[model samples]
Target: KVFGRCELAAAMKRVGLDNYRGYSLGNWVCAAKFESNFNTQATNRNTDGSTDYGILQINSRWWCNDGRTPGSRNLCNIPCSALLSSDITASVNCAKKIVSDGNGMNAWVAWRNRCKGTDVQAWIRGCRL
Candidate 1:
């Protein structure tokens, strides 16, 4: 489960990050650390025992849209695990869509700041995506 920088960069390229110049690699790494401590196989549970899956902690229900649910027949069909499995670029791409419609890196930076005791939304101001 040890993902290297080249693997992360390759995963990012697979997710359309090449379209955006100046995507912050450091910010993405920081955000991943904040989200799931960079653990690709990490899982968390709701009080009722339902699970949140992967490094990005993507809820199984939402990621199901991408057809990457755990135990699905097409597990590696769409690079979803690469997208979620502690791959910083992939996580940033996912977070970009979720947080700012792929327009800003502020959201990613803000998320990173959460690990440093700063407010999430507020710290996102003026970041490059």
Candidate 2:
């Protein structure tokens, strides 16, 4: 399902992305907007043969095992399919793990190009915290 902007923000908040790893909820919301436009079933196949999955577009090469990526360490220990559901718990948890591993939000190219060093308040300005 595709989520509305505020709906996605509230959902991420429910799973604790607010201020996670020093990243404000707005940061996450902005990234999600650029990543997959809040579409839970979104997937992007990389030239390196990896695929990004779900709302946050978690990658198969390191984050989730789609069973097709050439050398996936499956660092997140989750099936890539798990990230494609309307329920985003698995994706949210893996996002936390990615930051916890010290990669920070830079792990996502969209986050770097679209959200990083930018004022993301517009992503959540009208959203209820």
Candidate 3:
């Protein structure tokens, strides 16, 4: 199912991204939009034969296991399918681990390509949270 941007942004806040040092609610919104278009079941294949999973589109190339890559350097230590669910708890948790691992938002291409050098604060405008 797809989420409205507002709902997705609010969910991100609940997961504690409201004021992360290098992360803004808007950057999260932009990342979620470009990554999965707010769809929880979103998935994609990377050029290197890996899959991206979930709303943040966490990649199997370095983070999670898609069951396709056998020995992934899974820093998140999660089944990629766990990220594709509607709950989003596991997805957010894995993302936290990813950011903490030194990549920060640079771990996500969507954030780098789109959210970067953009007005990320606008992504969560009017949520008042």
Candidate 4:
């Protein structure tokens, strides 16, 4: 499933990403925009042999286990398959798990390159929040 700007914003907010780990709702929206274009089934096979899953682009190397990644930490303790649904609650929860590990939102390179330190209000500009 794909989400519009405000639609994604509302979904993330419903799952408590607004001000989560000191990051704003816009930041989460920005990350999801760049990482997967708000596509729930988005997946990317990385050069390192791990894969990114879902709208948040969570990696198999450390966040979710895909069962084939070697020596994966599986820090979120969930299968990557759980992240591919139209319902984003699990994905958002897993993202929260990733951020709580002390690296914060920097866990996502897409966010670091696209959303980090930028004015993210545009991501949620039309949302009532």
Q: What is the C-alpha RMSD of each candidate to the true structure, in Å?
A: 7.8, 0.9, 1.5, 1.0
What is the lDDT for 12 in model 2? 93
Candidate 3 Cα misplacement greater than 4 A, ranges: none
lDDT at 26 for candidate 4?
A: 90
The lDDT values for all models are: 0.48, 0.91, 0.84, 0.91
Q: Per-residue lDDT tens digits of candidate 1, residues 15-87?
A: 6654355544444444555656666776665454334545455444433234434443322233444554544
Over 1-129, each residue of candidate 2 has an lDDT whose tens digit, in order, gives 899999989999999999998999999999989999999999999999999999999999998899899889888898999999999899999999987887799988999998888889888987776
**Candidate 4 weakest ten by summed lDDT:** 120-129
Steric overlap count per candidate: 0, 0, 0, 0
* Predicted candidate 4 versus true structure: per-residue lDDT over 1-129, tens digit per residue: 999889889888888999998998999999999999999999999999999999999999998889999999998889999999999998998888889988898888989998898999888886776
Residue 101, candidate 2: Cα error in Å is 2.2
- Check candidate 4 and list the clashing pairs: none
Positional deviation of 58 in candidate 2, in angstroms?
Answer: 0.7
Error of 2 at 50 (Å): 0.9
lDDT (Cα, 0-100) at 34 in candidate 3: 86
Model 3: lDDT to the true structure: 0.84
Give lDDT: candidate 1, residue 37: 66
* Regions more than 4 Å wrong, model 2: none
Between candidates 1 and 2, the one scoring higher on lDDT is 2
For candidate 2, the lDDT comes to 0.91
